[PDB]
């Protein structure tokens, strides 16, 4: 399900727990508007996919976490993979991000 | 000097009153590494060119400004010219904000 992100310790905890299964975390922003529009797939492709863990973390309330992570852009996804970040990109792409999901899992 | 906006009445009359002149604005947010890295370079760009008008929109402060300019990246540099956009471009690139200055002058 997407797990909303309030903490540097949630984060690292969640990228703990989620052990060999691939993570895909959404840095979004109130104020883009791409942020918004692709937010529902984001929430299908997590209905989609059991085997992957997504994550929000809205970069204003955790802007350490956005800071540590170096997120230049709205919306960033970035992808993790045992606590190494295996992949990214920006921009409300919806067939690459379901694409990267695909080649990452 | 650089204006700080914090509002979007304050910045529409900035926008107003530059009359003829250039207007280059600074999106930035607290959380981006590369805005504090261009943040002094920007302010010594002011100095430098009196007949330039330089503002800085913090897109937290702001978010109605931030998102109806479209701001998509942490820096964006927008440049207008009697209320019409004219330039854009993102990241904390110093010889390019200056190049561009000197294209648009």
């Known amino acids: 399900m997407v797990k909303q ?7 690292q905890e969640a990228l703990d727990a989620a ?8 840095f979004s922003a109130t ?5 918004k529009m692709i937010k529902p797939f984001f929430h299908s492709l997590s209905e989609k996919y059991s085997n ?7 970069v204003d309330d955790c ?5 540590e ?13 045992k606590g190494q970040k295996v992949g990214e990109f920006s921009g409300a792409n919806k067939e690459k ?4 999901i695909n080649e990452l899992v």
Request: glycine share 4%; with cysteine; aromatic share 12%.
């Open 5 to 11: 992100i309030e903490s540097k310790t949630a984060f």
């Open 19 to 26: 052990g060999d299964k691939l993570v895909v975390v959404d």
């Open 31 to 35: 104020w883009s508007g791409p942020s």
């Open 52 to 58: 992957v863990i997504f994550l929000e973390v809205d």
């Open 63 to 67: 802007q350490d976490v956005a800071s």
């Open 69 to 81: 992570c170096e997120v230049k852009c709205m919306p960033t996804f970035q992808f993790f993979k």
């Open 97 to 100: 991000l379901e694409a990267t």
